[PDB]
């Protein structure tokens, strides 16, 4: 069971700086007099580390449920043994497995289960009246657990329950990691006489336990112990004391470290590779002593920022206007067939309008039509009354669907239909439109018939004259201005798209972003995905060329298609990070030199030199740089660059 706390005045968390802390043994091997570099998760030196308070003198009690990243660093400068243990988990609602690590007064146990955690687990310590000793009775950490897998009991560490307000005398560090489901604990007790701003001393953390649990951890909380003496009333609402305590919480991130080993295989010093140029020079040479001279550590490369695309101009508008704005429309049994090819497709005006009634596209989806390029585009056109519009779709059957116009079952086209009653019919009605009512058999898809013979229905021939049992398959349509909506004439245009072995001639519209120049950008001018700047050239191109190469056979000049400018292609920049060192036992600062990158800061002939001040006078030079300019450490005293004297 658990109880809830009451609101009070707390203290905001502050931030402190680490000083060579968070270094542990990365493996279970022995290395003697070895400078070995490994990739593992440590705490970076001189990094921002989150700080919490636990001292009463007020009423500071802040234990948030901090997120658990890949590896954490927990350092406590415990004196009166107020800290008890730690818990882990993801949701803390008896749904996932969760850790319970508590250093009790009798023994240390490691139980991982689904304990029902309250909003603030804590341990309660009372001061007995007859007994002058501090003892713990309120074991309010969780309610119950259902089932679990792993359990462990550590050594019976002796715990002191007495809290004071004096200065700290011991420092304890803890590192918790979870790789491949394996829990790692690193700890070491280090005495110190300090209260704040942890010293710059070095102390490697030895492994303690390797508990196999194999669950997920993303949240963790801290357990603190308070005291209930005779001064406080004894209620956990507004009056309590907690002694004096402090704990630090840090997060680990992966870095590359160079570790020094002595003759008995203990870590003495650590050098980073991504913190200081001097540290990079030390860790690249695999030595702790750097002499004077030039050194190459890494390289430098600029990255592209934007990605511009300029497709060529499009103006070949397809003849979609007159095929839709046609004064005369053919009959259903004599439907027109028009081929559209060798033009830039423009369906934008086709779907942005709303005068049409049907916009169903079978086979292909109309949401992507401008990005599809086809070889042949066909367009039929016929007029049908409003009832026989659903018969156009494949699969359905009817008079129009099987005797006048049949569509294949694998249609990948579109059907456009709209209503035009006033245009297609006058006050007296239209009678110039013919349709077929009878046929010998069914009609194959994409087949039209023109013959107007006499349909035979019976067995006895009628000798080719009008009579019984044989009639005219072709019949006329009647139209009225005041008829029903379903009897009004409707114009239907069917689009068919097919793919052949010929190159594609119908293509959709393309987009073109604005042209940015004199910057390291990426462009794709229909033949290459080149990244680089686009300067203004002074050489003209013949009016048939789009590309351009050089002596070394590299595409470095491409003409922009929409305004006909000739633009050059140049790689952005690249080089190496050279450093000059005064040497050992002489200085500590370095200066960064670039081989050919063009930009305290001095613009030398041999690249860009920063961190070295240029001086006009000339002495004898010792550290070569190039182009008649060297560097030296001369009078405080700093690194200078000058022309060498012969």
């Amino acid at each position: 069971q658990c109880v809830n706390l009451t609101t009070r005045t707390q203290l905001p968390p502050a931030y402190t700086n680490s000083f060579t802390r968070g270094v542990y043994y990365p493996d279970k091997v022995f290395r003697s007099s070895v400078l070995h570099s490994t990739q593992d998760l440590f705490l970076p030196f001189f990094s921002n580390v989150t700080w919490f308070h636990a001292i009463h003198v007020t009423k500071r009690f802040d234990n948030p449920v901090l997120p658990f990243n890949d590896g954490v660093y927990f350092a406590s400068t415990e004196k009166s043994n107020i800290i008890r243990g730690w818990i882990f988990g993801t949701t803390l609602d008896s749904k996932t497995q969760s850790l319970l690590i508590v250093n009790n007064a009798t023994n240390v146990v490691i139980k991982v289960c689904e304990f029902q955690f309250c909003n603030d687990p804590f341990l309660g310590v009372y001061y007995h009246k007859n007994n002058k000793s501090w003892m713990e009775s309120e074991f309010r950490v969780y309610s119950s657990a259902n089932n679990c897998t792993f359990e462990y009991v550590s050594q019976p560490f002796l715990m002191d329950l007495e809290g004071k307000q004096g200065n700290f005398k011991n420092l304890r560090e803890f590192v918790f990691k979870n790789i491949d489901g394996y829990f790692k604990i690193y700890s070491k007790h280090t005495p110190i006489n300090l209260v704040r701003d942890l010293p710059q001393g070095f102390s490697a953390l030895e492994p303690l336990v390797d508990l196999p649990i194999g669950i997920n951890i993303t949240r963790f909380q801290t357990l603190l112990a308070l005291h209930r003496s005779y001064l406080t009333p004894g209620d956990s609402s507004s009056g309590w004391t907690a002694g004096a305590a402090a704990y630090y919480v840090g997060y680990l991130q992966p870095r590359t470290f160079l570790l020094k080993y002595n003759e008995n295989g203990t870590i003495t010093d650590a050098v980073d590779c991504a913190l200081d140029p001097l540290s990079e020079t030390k860790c690249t040479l695999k030595s702790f002593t750097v002499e004077k001279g030039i050194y190459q550590t890494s390289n430098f490369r600029v990255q592209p920022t934007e990605s511009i695309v300029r497709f060529p101009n499009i103006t070949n508008l397809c003849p979609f206007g007159e095929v839709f704005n046609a004064t005369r429309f053919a009959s259903v049994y004599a439907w027109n067939r028009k081929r559209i090819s060798n033009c830039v497709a423009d369906y934008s005006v086709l779907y942005n309008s709303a005068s049409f009634s049907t916009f169903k596209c079978y086979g292909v989806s109309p949401t992507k039509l401008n990005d599809l390029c086809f070889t042949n585009v066909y367009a039929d056109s016929f007029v049908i009354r409003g009832d026989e519009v659903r018969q156009i779709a494949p699969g359905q059957t009817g008079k129009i669907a099987d005797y006048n116009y049949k569509l294949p079952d694998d249609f990948t086209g579109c059907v456009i239909a709209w209503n035009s009653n006033n245009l297609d019919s006058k006050v007296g009605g239209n009678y110039n439109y013919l349709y077929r009512l009878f046929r010998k058999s069914n009609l194959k898809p994409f087949e039209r018939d023109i013959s107007t013979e006499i349909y035979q229905a019976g067995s006895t021939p009628c000798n080719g004259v009008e009579g019984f049992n044989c009639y005219f398959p072709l019949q006329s349509y009647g139209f009225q201005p005041t008829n029903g909506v379903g009897y009004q004439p409707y114009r239907v245009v069917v689009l068919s798209f097919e793919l052949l072995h010929a190159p594609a001639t119908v293509c959709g519209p393309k987009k073109s972003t604005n042209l940015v120049k004199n910057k390291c950008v990426n462009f794709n001018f229909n033949g290459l995905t080149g990244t680089g700047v686009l300067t203004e050239s002074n050489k003209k191109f013949l009016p048939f060329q789009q590309f351009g190469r050089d002596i070394a056979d590299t595409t470095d000049a491409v003409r922009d298609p929409q305004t006909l400018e000739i633009l050059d292609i140049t790689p952005c920049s690249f080089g190496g990070v050279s450093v000059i060192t005064p040497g050992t036992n002489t200085s500590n600062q370095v200066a960064v030199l670039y081989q050919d990158v063009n930009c305290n800061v001095f613009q030398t002939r041999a690249g860009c030199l920063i961190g070295a001040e240029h001086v006009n006078n000339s002495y004898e030079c010792d550290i070569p740089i190039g182009a008649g300019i060297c560097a030296s450490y001369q009078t405080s005293q700093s690194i200078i660059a000058y022309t060498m004297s012969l």
Partner: antibody, heavy 120, light 110 residues
Framework: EVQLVESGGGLVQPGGSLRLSCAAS????????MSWVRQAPGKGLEWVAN????????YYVDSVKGRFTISRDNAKNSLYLQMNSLRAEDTAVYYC?????????????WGQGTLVTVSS | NFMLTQPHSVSESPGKTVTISCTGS????????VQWYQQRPGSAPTTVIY?????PSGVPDRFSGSIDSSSNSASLTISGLKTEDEADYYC?????????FGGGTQLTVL
């Protein structure tokens, strides 16, 4: 990621005039169809009006025909809705609806909306 | 007078496949595209099914749609029936220059 902001309601008037505004960002306003959709509190969805990407063609429902108007502009990327001669049925939550290709693709865009009630 | 007919309380079921039918009377709904809209109660609506066969990006593949032209009805099928289904659904069509919306099918008990 497209932001739609509507702030045109919050007051009651019988038979007056009201001006609702929807603000849009993150896309090109002058190339897709636009619409306005309202729903009654506790009732189902119903369509109100639509407008082309250039404002040339506008349509409404027959219940609000005669009254109502819609206008747009592409310079400041905003949609304008104006109402007149309101009734008691007009208690509704109005969302500015954005299209992709036309009236067949789908609404698929419902701005959070603004609560609009009318009382005497 | 185009309108769409669909129920109001269906799919009150744990963890299996259930279909919801929306149908019209004035005309054939298979002529034009019909889409399904899915709305948080007390928040902005969204869309689960568009184009009548596809779904927007980020929508789980549990939802699916089909068209039956014999009964002139549109079917929406949900497979997972997980805990993220507390909504009312609508079917929307397009007859001629106007939009028509469905009544609404409340689904709360999952």
């Amino acid at each position: 990621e497209v932001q739609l902001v509507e702030s045109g309601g919050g007051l009651v008037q019988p038979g007056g005039s009201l001006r609702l505004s929807c603000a849009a960002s993150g896309f090109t306003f002058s190339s897709y169809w636009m619409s306005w959709v309202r729903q009654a509190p506790g009732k189902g969805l119903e369509w109100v009006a639509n407008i082309k990407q250039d404002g040339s063609e506008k349509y409404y429902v027959d219940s609000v025909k005669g009254r109502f108007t819609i206008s747009r502009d592409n310079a400041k990327n905003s949609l304008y809705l104006q109402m007149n001669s309101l009734r008691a049925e007009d208690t509704a939550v109005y969302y500015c609806a954005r299209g992709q290709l036309g009236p067949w693709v789908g609404v698929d865009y419902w701005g959070q909306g603004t609560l609009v009630t009318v009382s005497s | 007078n185009f309108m769409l007919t669909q129920p109001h309380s269906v799919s009150e079921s744990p963890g299996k496949t259930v279909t919801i039918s929306c149908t019209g009377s004035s005309g054939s709904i298979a002529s034009n595209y019909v889409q399904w809209y899915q709305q948080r109660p007390g928040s902005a609506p969204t869309t689960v099914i568009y184009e009548d066969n596809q779904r927007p990006s980020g929508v789980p593949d549990r939802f699916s749609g089909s068209i039956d032209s014999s009964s002139n009805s549109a079917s929406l099928t949900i497979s997972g029936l997980k805990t993220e289904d507390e909504a009312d659904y609508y079917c929307q069509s397009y007859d001629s220059s106007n939009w028509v919306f469905g009544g609404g099918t409340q689904l709360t008990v999952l």
